[PDB]
């Protein structure tokens, strides 16, 4: 199906003396496989998945020299954004960088990402056309035209459209048992009556992968339904439930519609 | 695969 490889970075500055924390994590279709933390004694690129584990000594050395080079870049990015916003060194700020690849069922390139963020707000982001940038505030306009003159997106395009998809396809094959799977939501329903006049129907969806599901409450085929964010169970599958408070006796009116990639037929659940 | 090139802000 549609897979993806993303790289998430987090660099939080430490006020004064002390090395700021650098975080690097890699996800292959929402599955972590590598990690790096500047506050760990290993000082290397650590694997968090079996597929990437047996990649040889040359792989880890090259990746560690690059995560250390991405760190040296984020050290300068902290102080640079300090001057852009005219901030003092006594503060602590968070820089978030993410670039990745998206790929469909055809296993061809479709979208590429490369975006930054400073103190939780957007900064600069790579558009869908991969040749123009987006500046959030005024300080971001300084780096928008600094990267337009240096053609950074064409040099990034050679990665998003080139090397990154090749290694994404490689990572999918090495972990086929835990990557391309489409598990189906083991849906069920529960009935909790808060009083003798009303009751809370609840539509569950358990043990499904990927996280793409849709839970909608409809009465006789026809929005005040309590929906919670798709949460992980930990075993590699996700969960999600949608509940609506209904008057007692009208439970036959309401139906739940579960749609998922693994489900060939869109399910409709009834009490 | 981390991208071999690093770009400064």
């Amino acid at each position: 199906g549609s897979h993806s490889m993303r790289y998430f970075f987090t660099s939080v500055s430490r006020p004064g003396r002390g090395e700021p924390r650098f975080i690097a994590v890699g996800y292959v279709d929402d599955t972590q496989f590598v990690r790096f933390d500047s506050d760990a004694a290993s000082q290397r690129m650590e694997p968090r998945a079996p597929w990437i584990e047996q990649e040889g000594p040359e792989y880890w050395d090259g990746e560690t020299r690059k995560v250390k080079a991405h760190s040296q870049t984020h050290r300068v990015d902290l102080g640079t954004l300090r001057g852009y916003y005219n901030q003092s060194e006594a503060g602590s700020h968070t820089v978030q960088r993410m670039y990745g690849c998206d790929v469909g069922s055809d296993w061809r390139f479709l979208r590429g990402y490369h975006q930054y963020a400073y103190d939780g707000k957007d900064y600069i982001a790579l558009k869908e056309d991969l040749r123009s940038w987006t500046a959030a505030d005024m300080a971001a306009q300084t780096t928008k035209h600094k990267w337009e003159a240096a053609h950074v997106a064409e040099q990034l395009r050679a990665y998003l459209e080139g090397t990154c998809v090749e290694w994404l396809r490689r990572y999918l094959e090495n972990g086929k048992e835990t990557l391309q799977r489409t598990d189906a939501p083991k849906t069920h329903m529960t009935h909790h009556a808060v009083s003798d006049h009303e009751a809370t129907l609840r539509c569950w969806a358990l043990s499904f992968y990927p996280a793409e599901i849709t839970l909608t409450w409809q009465r006789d085929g026809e929005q005040d339904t309590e929906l919670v964010e798709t949460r992980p169970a930990g075993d590699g599958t996700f969960q999600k439930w949608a509940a609506v408070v209904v008057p007692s006796g009208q439970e036959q009116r309401y139906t739940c519609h579960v749609q998922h990639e693994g489900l060939p037929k869109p399910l409709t659940l009834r009490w | 695969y981390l991208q071999p090139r690093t770009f400064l802000l």
Partner: T-cell receptor, first 108, second 111 residues
């Protein structure tokens, strides 16, 4: 082969002629490419940057083919000012790796 | 507009020598290449950020130190593989990748 391999040369062409350079890089993940000019006993000077689009800079035209991993420099109406060795520069990580170079000597 | 010193250099065999390389254009990184006839440019040392420095393809027998952003001295030690040789210093703009070299320093050994 090597990480950056070009033509052995040298190239001895008459004035005004067109000279074509070639370069093959082994690292498929490379993304920054440049053509550098270096005179005899001098330092290399950046001639132009290379992009997959194929940028034309007056008499100099550089083209890139990431598929075949090959870079070509084209110089038309070569003058005596062009007599130098032209180095093919490809990136490793952020460090640039230089090829052995090909020499162009223009005869008037 | 990076400046390397001295442009021409000579040192006896067994005597160490340091060639300086400062930059006034506020570059991002600094590199140390070398040129010998018959082969291309081979990387020696390079520093992406201040107080850091990484080895190159022929770093054995050389030593650098990036204690300041506007200096990156290379010390040609008693590594005997240095007869007449072109030692070059470069400065990179990480956004563009362009390498800006100094006028170069020619080191020759005399017995």
């Amino acid at each position: 082969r090597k990480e950056v391999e070009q033509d052995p040369g040298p190239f001895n062409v008459p004035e005004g002629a067109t000279v074509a350079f070639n370069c093959t890089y082994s690292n498929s993940a490379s993304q920054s490419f440049f053509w550098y000019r270096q005179d005899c006993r001098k330092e290399p000077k950046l001639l132009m940057s290379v992009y997959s689009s194929g940028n034309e800079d007056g008499r100099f035209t550089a083209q890139l083919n990431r598929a075949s991993q090959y870079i070509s420099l084209l110089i038309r109406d070569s003058k005596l000012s062009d007599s130098a060795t032209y180095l093919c520069v490809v990136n490793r990580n952020n460090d640039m790796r230089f090829g052995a170079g090909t020499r162009l000597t223009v005869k008037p | 507009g990076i400046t390397q010193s001295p442009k021409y250099l000579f040192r006896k065999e067994g005597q160490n020598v340091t060639l300086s390389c400062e930059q006034n254009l506020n570059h991002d990184a600094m590199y140390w290449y070398r040129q010998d006839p018959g082969q291309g440019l081979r990387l020696i040392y390079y520093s992406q950020i201040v107080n850091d420095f990484q080895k190159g393809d022929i770093a054995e027998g050389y030593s650098v130190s990036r204690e300041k952003k506007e200096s990156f001295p290379l010390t040609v030690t008693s590594a005997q593989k240095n007869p007449t040789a072109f030692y070059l210093c470069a400065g990179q703009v990480t956004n563009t990748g362009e390498l800006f070299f100094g006028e170069g320093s020619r080191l020759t050994v005399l017995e």
